[PDB]
Design a protein around this nucleic acid. Sequence first.
RNA 1: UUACCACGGAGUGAUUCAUGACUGGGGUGAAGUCGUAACAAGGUAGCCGUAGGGGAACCUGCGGCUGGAUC
RNA 2: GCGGGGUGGAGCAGCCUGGUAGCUCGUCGGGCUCAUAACCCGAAGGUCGUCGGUUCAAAUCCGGCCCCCGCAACCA
RNA 3: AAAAUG
RNA 4: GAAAGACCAAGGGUUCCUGCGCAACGUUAAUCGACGCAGGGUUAGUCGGUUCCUAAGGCGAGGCUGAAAAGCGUAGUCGAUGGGAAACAGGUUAAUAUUCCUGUACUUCUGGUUACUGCGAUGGAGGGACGGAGAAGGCUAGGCCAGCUUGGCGUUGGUUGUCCAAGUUUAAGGUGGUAGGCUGAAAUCUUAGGUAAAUCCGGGGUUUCAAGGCCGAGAGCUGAUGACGAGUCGUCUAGAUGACGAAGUGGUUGAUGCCAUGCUUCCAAGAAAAGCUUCUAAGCUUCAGGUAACCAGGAACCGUACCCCAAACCGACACAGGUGGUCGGGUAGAGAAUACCAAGGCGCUUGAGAGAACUCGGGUGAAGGAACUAGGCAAAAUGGCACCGUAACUUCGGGAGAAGGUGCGCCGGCUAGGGUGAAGGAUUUACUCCGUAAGCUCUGGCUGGUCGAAGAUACCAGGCCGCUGCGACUGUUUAUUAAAAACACAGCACUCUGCAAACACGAAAGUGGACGUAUAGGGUGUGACGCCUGCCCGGUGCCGGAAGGUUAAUUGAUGG
RNA 5: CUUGUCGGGUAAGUUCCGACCUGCACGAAUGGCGUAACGAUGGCGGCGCUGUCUCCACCCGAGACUCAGUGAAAUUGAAA
RNA 6: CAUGCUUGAGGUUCUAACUCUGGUCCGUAAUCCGGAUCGAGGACAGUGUAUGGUGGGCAGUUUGACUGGGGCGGUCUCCU
Lengths: 44, 272
Amino acid sequence: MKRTFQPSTLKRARVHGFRARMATKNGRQVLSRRRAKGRKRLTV
Amino acid sequence: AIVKCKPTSAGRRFVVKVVNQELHKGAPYAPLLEKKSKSGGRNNNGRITTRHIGGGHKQHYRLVDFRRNKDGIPAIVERVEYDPNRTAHIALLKYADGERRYIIAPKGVAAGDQLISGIGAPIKAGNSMPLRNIPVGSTVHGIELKPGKGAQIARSAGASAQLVAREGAYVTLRLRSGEMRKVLAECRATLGEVSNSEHSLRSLGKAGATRWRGVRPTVRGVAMNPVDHPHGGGEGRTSAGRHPVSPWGLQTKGKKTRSNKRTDNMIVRRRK
RNA sequence: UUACCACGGAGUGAUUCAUGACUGGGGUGAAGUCGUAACAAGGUAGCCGUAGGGGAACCUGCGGCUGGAUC
RNA sequence: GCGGGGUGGAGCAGCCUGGUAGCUCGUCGGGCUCAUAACCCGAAGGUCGUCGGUUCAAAUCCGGCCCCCGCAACCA
RNA sequence: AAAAUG
RNA sequence: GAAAGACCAAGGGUUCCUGCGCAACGUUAAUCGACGCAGGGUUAGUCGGUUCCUAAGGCGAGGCUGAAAAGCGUAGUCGAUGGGAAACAGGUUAAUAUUCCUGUACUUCUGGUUACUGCGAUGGAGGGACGGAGAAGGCUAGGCCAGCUUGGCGUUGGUUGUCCAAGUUUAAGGUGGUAGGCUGAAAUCUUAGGUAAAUCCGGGGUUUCAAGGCCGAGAGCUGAUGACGAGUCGUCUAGAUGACGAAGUGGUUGAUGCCAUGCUUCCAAGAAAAGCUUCUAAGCUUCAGGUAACCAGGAACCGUACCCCAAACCGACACAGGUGGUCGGGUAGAGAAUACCAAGGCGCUUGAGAGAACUCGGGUGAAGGAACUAGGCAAAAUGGCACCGUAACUUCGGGAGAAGGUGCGCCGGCUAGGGUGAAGGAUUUACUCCGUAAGCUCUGGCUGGUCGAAGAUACCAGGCCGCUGCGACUGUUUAUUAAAAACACAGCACUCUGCAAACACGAAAGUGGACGUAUAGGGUGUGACGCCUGCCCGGUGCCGGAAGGUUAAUUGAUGG
RNA sequence: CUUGUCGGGUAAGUUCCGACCUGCACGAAUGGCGUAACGAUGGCGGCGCUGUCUCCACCCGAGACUCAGUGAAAUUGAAA
RNA sequence: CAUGCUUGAGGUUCUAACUCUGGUCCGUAAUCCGGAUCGAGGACAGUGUAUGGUGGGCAGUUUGACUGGGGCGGUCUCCU
Ligand SMILES: [Mg+2]
Ligand SMILES: [Mg+2]
Ligand SMILES: [Mg+2]
Ligand SMILES: [Mg+2]
Ligand SMILES: [Mg+2]
Ligand SMILES: [Mg+2]
Ligand SMILES: [Mg+2]
Ligand SMILES: [Mg+2]
Ligand SMILES: [Mg+2]
Ligand SMILES: [Mg+2]
Ligand SMILES: [Mg+2]
Ligand SMILES: [Mg+2]
Ligand SMILES: [Mg+2]
Ligand SMILES: [Mg+2]
Ligand SMILES: [Mg+2]
Ligand SMILES: [Mg+2]
Ligand SMILES: [Mg+2]
Ligand SMILES: [Mg+2]
Ligand SMILES: [Mg+2]
Ligand SMILES: [Mg+2]
Ligand SMILES: [Mg+2]
Ligand SMILES: [Mg+2]
Ligand SMILES: [Mg+2]
Ligand SMILES: [Mg+2]
Ligand SMILES: [Mg+2]
Ligand SMILES: [Mg+2]
Ligand SMILES: [Mg+2]
Ligand SMILES: [Mg+2]
Ligand SMILES: [Mg+2]
Ligand SMILES: [Mg+2]
Ligand SMILES: [Mg+2]
Ligand SMILES: [Mg+2]
Ligand SMILES: [Mg+2]
Ligand SMILES: [Mg+2]
Ligand SMILES: [Mg+2]
Ligand SMILES: [Mg+2]
Ligand SMILES: [Mg+2]
Ligand SMILES: [Mg+2]
Ligand SMILES: [Mg+2]
Ligand SMILES: [Mg+2]
Ligand SMILES: [Mg+2]
Ligand SMILES: [Mg+2]
Ligand SMILES: [Mg+2]
Ligand SMILES: [Mg+2]
Ligand SMILES: [Mg+2]
Ligand SMILES: [Mg+2]
Ligand SMILES: [Mg+2]
Ligand SMILES: [Mg+2]
Ligand SMILES: [Mg+2]
Ligand SMILES: [Mg+2]
Ligand SMILES: [Mg+2]
Ligand SMILES: [Mg+2]
Ligand SMILES: [Mg+2]
Ligand SMILES: [Mg+2]
Ligand SMILES: [Mg+2]
Ligand SMILES: [Mg+2]
Ligand SMILES: [Mg+2]
Ligand SMILES: [Mg+2]
Ligand SMILES: [Mg+2]
Ligand SMILES: [Mg+2]
Ligand SMILES: [Mg+2]
Ligand SMILES: [Mg+2]
Ligand SMILES: [Mg+2]
Ligand SMILES: [Mg+2]
Ligand SMILES: [Mg+2]
Ligand SMILES: [Mg+2]
Ligand SMILES: [Mg+2]
Ligand SMILES: [Mg+2]
Ligand SMILES: [Mg+2]
Ligand SMILES: [Mg+2]
Ligand SMILES: [Mg+2]
Ligand SMILES: [Mg+2]
Ligand SMILES: [Mg+2]
Ligand SMILES: [Mg+2]
Ligand SMILES: [Mg+2]
Ligand SMILES: [Mg+2]
Ligand SMILES: [Mg+2]
Ligand SMILES: [Mg+2]
Ligand SMILES: [Mg+2]
Ligand SMILES: [Mg+2]
Ligand SMILES: [Mg+2]
Ligand SMILES: [Mg+2]
Ligand SMILES: [Mg+2]
Ligand SMILES: [Mg+2]
Ligand SMILES: [Mg+2]
Ligand SMILES: [Mg+2]
Ligand SMILES: [Mg+2]
Ligand SMILES: [Mg+2]
Ligand SMILES: [Mg+2]
Ligand SMILES: [Mg+2]
Ligand SMILES: [Mg+2]
Ligand SMILES: [Mg+2]
Ligand SMILES: [Mg+2]
Ligand SMILES: [Mg+2]
Ligand SMILES: [Mg+2]
Ligand SMILES: [Mg+2]
Ligand SMILES: [Mg+2]
Ligand SMILES: [Mg+2]
Ligand SMILES: [Mg+2]
Ligand SMILES: [Mg+2]
Ligand SMILES: [Mg+2]
Ligand SMILES: [Mg+2]
Ligand SMILES: [Mg+2]
Ligand SMILES: [Mg+2]
Ligand SMILES: [Mg+2]
Ligand SMILES: [Mg+2]
Ligand SMILES: [Mg+2]
Ligand SMILES: [Mg+2]
Ligand SMILES: [Mg+2]
Ligand SMILES: [Mg+2]
Ligand SMILES: [Mg+2]
Ligand SMILES: [Mg+2]
Ligand SMILES: [Mg+2]
Ligand SMILES: [Mg+2]
Ligand SMILES: [Mg+2]
Ligand SMILES: [Mg+2]
Ligand SMILES: [Mg+2]
Ligand SMILES: [Mg+2]
Ligand SMILES: [Mg+2]
Ligand SMILES: [Mg+2]
Ligand SMILES: [Mg+2]
Ligand SMILES: [Mg+2]
Ligand SMILES: [Mg+2]
Ligand SMILES: [Mg+2]
Ligand SMILES: [Mg+2]
Ligand SMILES: [Mg+2]
């Protein structure tokens, strides 16, 4: 049976990557909201 | 010539093919082709704006001359071709100084013909010249609405318009729809009608022949739910218990939808 | 022991008789019912082919004939 | 269970608003016709389904009864 | 103009 | 054994190898491990990326639009799943190899010297550059057989021989321009064209000739007196070491691989851009630049371990599930089905007994043969090739493999062919034409004999027929209780739309429709085909009309 | 109403096939009536075949049973 | 009754406002966008604001209680 998560690193960086969050102000607030929680990962 | 197919299979029983043995069967003129991609009926927002569109065969675009503004130089028809994106055929012309061009093929031009254009051209079919000095009562095709803009009207297969009247700086001509519309006498037109007049005598034969042209199935609103169509719902087959209507709530069995009001003065008589 | 071959079996067709619920017209019969289509110019001149309609004879359209009356 | 009706021989008005029963066909009698039909003229014909009640007066109002015609009789 | 039948 | 073998991509990240370990992990124990500790291991001008080019799409200087955030989009520049330079055989470690080593190649760049010279683009032309199906050939890998070399002479009848076993290998490149495919060629004069120019391309005229020009597998020759090769000899600790090292050839068969981005044919009419060739513009012009030969050097950076149809990836697991592409031998066989094997890999991480009921998966069954049941559910049965033969009905295609029936194993006798192919002949005297006995291979025919209970002998491999309802058919559908009569469909009709089209997404700019133009586009209903589709415009819709009656903001006469 | 009535098929047929017309409450593009070919479509009937059945019997593997090792689950106010 | 002064209503025409998803020139190497110039329409169209009509395309809601279960039926205030 095919499961929901079929991994790929190119489609991972182009949707959730750092340079994909910094493109829009809605993703630039995800980063600021994570720098304030204190996260260690902060980007996929 | 239309050819009826033998009922060898269930999908060949009702296939009526339009086959012309005089079309060119080599390759199109490469310098006058460019790519074109499909859209699926989606605009730049990515949303479906016109539905029942999708699929088909890859096609090239042929640069067809709709202006025909080489006035004076005689031409020569070199071949008549197939165009994936018309219903008419196209004619490849070679002018007296190279300069090959595509045009829409008239009714009876095959391999010779001169097809000159401009004021002072003869009154043979395939010649292009302004509507001012086209004799009254003759049939024309490829009529342009704005000077220098290119042909707009009477462009599909077997299409034509007829010059009915002329007074002032305008000419009145009766469209294939049955409408009288006055056109500027400065605009140009071509004499005769358009080729491939037997295009209407065809039968696709099967559901798969619709898909080869990029057309997707049409579901009818009665076969839906109330959330999807104004016609949907009901136990068993219902007959759309309200007056028939569009999916977006506009009535379709007789309601007029023209609201231009700017170009009304060019409509002498309505089509209906 | 092999070959020929009668009886008898198996499958599938053709043809011809008898019969069959129910149905289409036909013929004959009596003081039956509804009308009056034709015969006189039969009271809308009749017939022929064809198409549509109607309880029924029949009516109407298109073409044809005189085997149609009056002057 | 709810609703609408029962009036000459037949099919329909009159019941709203209590005091006057009408239309067509049919029947009878006389006409025109050689005779019947068609047509013309003149008449008869329903105390209003039954009982009970209010009222000075009931086809008409209010009840029961006998006859009919329509709907409804659902969820497990 | 109406004029069916025996 | 068309994988349960080998290899790429994704994904994983040390799981790879060695030494030392068994607490925990491993559905049992463990001395073992994909487990713990510690060391080691990944070598490139040619492989994959990066650098060069673009598709869908993304972003987008100015710009247009929008309360703000922001939306769209021009120039442009990112984006492979595509285009575009060049390497193969052998040896080697416990762990890497087209990378290291040996041997033989190929592509491209830089700096010089000589000799001759019009150089120059982002712009123009050519080229790159392409669909579905089908068919006839040519060839190659691979497979068999014969010969040859080396060894053997068989625990049990025979085996010194038309005996048994193994091996009989060798690439890239260079030379060659073949089977075959496409194309007329050269000279001279000229020009309403390729945004300017052009000697380049396109167009026009005249003269001459039947011969050039471009592609193109493959054979042969060479690479190669070399590598490899059963094995033998010497040395050492049963295994390591060094040297030597036989034969290494012909005939048939033959791909789904290459010629082939070819040829024929059909509509549904089948990517772009750069690299590449050539032409000139602006600029030099006796510097620069270009073209040839020789010499000397260079090719940076990143990934290379291991799993990869799985115990290492997606599923909470060492999970009967899922995962794209390549190779794919022998005997039967039409076959990549099926059966038994090769190369290679494995016996699936609890066992040992015993032989109760009952449950699961099967084998055989007396007489009967659907009597079972909601219902022939399940099971049983049929099953191949050749030949004979075959009904109603029909849209003339079909129904049809209708139905039903006969033969089939092995061993001899006689007999008809095809393909390949020495010697020969011919002139195109050489990668050539015709043709040949033996040999090898592939098709038949008529005629006996013979064994068994049974010869399509196992695996594999349609049950059929007669009335009816529905839907014309192929197809789609409720991922996870409904696959159907439901949806779609070709065909039909009504209706709107004259192009800045109707319509749809967007506070808008704009976009789709469509680089389309009434034989076109949207909506609606019906649903192949045959015969047909009757009456009603009172209700509610839509279309048309303008006379009269009403009727909003607005205006403000009059009166209080 | 209803298993309407008649005919066929079966020893026996609330289903099936052909008719009748009394259509509670068919009907002509929410199309009417037919139709060759097609269907993992609904109903009925035949031939063959059979453990479907009368009515089960024997046999072969995997559990179940015993021995050694590891070792759950739902549930549970307390239980003489 | 011509006149002179204004305004309401309509028709015809003109260009100069506005419009062009028409041509060619420039920015520029550019089917965007601006400017210039031709051509067409032209005080129309179109947009702002005020207003009548239409408008399940979309939205926020309502749709009573008693009742020998709920629904259907009946009842719901006053007098003897
Ligand atoms: Mg995505
Ligand atoms: Mg995560
Ligand atoms: Mg559509
Ligand atoms: Mg198209
Ligand atoms: Mg449809
Ligand atoms: Mg359709
Ligand atoms: Mg529809
Ligand atoms: Mg439906
Ligand atoms: Mg539905
Ligand atoms: Mg939706
Ligand atoms: Mg709705
Ligand atoms: Mg229904
Ligand atoms: Mg429905
Ligand atoms: Mg309805
Ligand atoms: Mg008559
Ligand atoms: Mg008469
Ligand atoms: Mg008469
Ligand atoms: Mg008469
Ligand atoms: Mg006749
Ligand atoms: Mg009539
Ligand atoms: Mg007649
Ligand atoms: Mg007549
Ligand atoms: Mg005649
Ligand atoms: Mg009388
Ligand atoms: Mg129910
Ligand atoms: Mg009579
Ligand atoms: Mg990786
Ligand atoms: Mg580790
Ligand atoms: Mg290991
Ligand atoms: Mg160890
Ligand atoms: Mg221990
Ligand atoms: Mg353990
Ligand atoms: Mg380890
Ligand atoms: Mg690039
Ligand atoms: Mg792009
Ligand atoms: Mg953008
Ligand atoms: Mg900006
Ligand atoms: Mg790029
Ligand atoms: Mg790039
Ligand atoms: Mg790639
Ligand atoms: Mg390895
Ligand atoms: Mg080397
Ligand atoms: Mg140059
Ligand atoms: Mg170019
Ligand atoms: Mg390609
Ligand atoms: Mg082709
Ligand atoms: Mg092809
Ligand atoms: Mg061979
Ligand atoms: Mg020997
Ligand atoms: Mg022996
Ligand atoms: Mg012996
Ligand atoms: Mg060689
Ligand atoms: Mg070679
Ligand atoms: Mg050749
Ligand atoms: Mg490596
Ligand atoms: Mg490796
Ligand atoms: Mg593997
Ligand atoms: Mg494997
Ligand atoms: Mg796992
Ligand atoms: Mg395991
Ligand atoms: Mg597994
Ligand atoms: Mg094999
Ligand atoms: Mg197999
Ligand atoms: Mg082995
Ligand atoms: Mg196990
Ligand atoms: Mg056991
Ligand atoms: Mg059992
Ligand atoms: Mg059995
Ligand atoms: Mg036996
Ligand atoms: Mg038995
Ligand atoms: Mg028996
Ligand atoms: Mg039997
Ligand atoms: Mg039974
Ligand atoms: Mg029973
Ligand atoms: Mg079965
Ligand atoms: Mg079976
Ligand atoms: Mg057969
Ligand atoms: Mg049959
Ligand atoms: Mg015998
Ligand atoms: Mg099958
Ligand atoms: Mg039935
Ligand atoms: Mg179907
Ligand atoms: Mg199919
Ligand atoms: Mg799907
Ligand atoms: Mg389901
Ligand atoms: Mg299905
Ligand atoms: Mg469906
Ligand atoms: Mg249409
Ligand atoms: Mg339908
Ligand atoms: Mg009406
Ligand atoms: Mg009306
Ligand atoms: Mg109106
Ligand atoms: Mg019944
Ligand atoms: Mg019966
Ligand atoms: Mg009987
Ligand atoms: Mg039965
Ligand atoms: Mg109708
Ligand atoms: Mg219906
Ligand atoms: Mg109906
Ligand atoms: Mg129908
Ligand atoms: Mg209808
Ligand atoms: Mg139907
Ligand atoms: Mg029918
Ligand atoms: Mg199907
Ligand atoms: Mg059927
Ligand atoms: Mg039975
Ligand atoms: Mg057993
Ligand atoms: Mg135990
Ligand atoms: Mg002007
Ligand atoms: Mg547009
Ligand atoms: Mg502009
Ligand atoms: Mg205006
Ligand atoms: Mg306005
Ligand atoms: Mg406005
Ligand atoms: Mg609402
Ligand atoms: Mg409302
Ligand atoms: Mg709503
Ligand atoms: Mg609220
Ligand atoms: Mg509410
Ligand atoms: Mg609500
Ligand atoms: Mg309320
Ligand atoms: Mg209540
Ligand atoms: Mg109650
Ligand atoms: Mg109770
Ligand atoms: Mg109670
Ligand atoms: Mg109630």
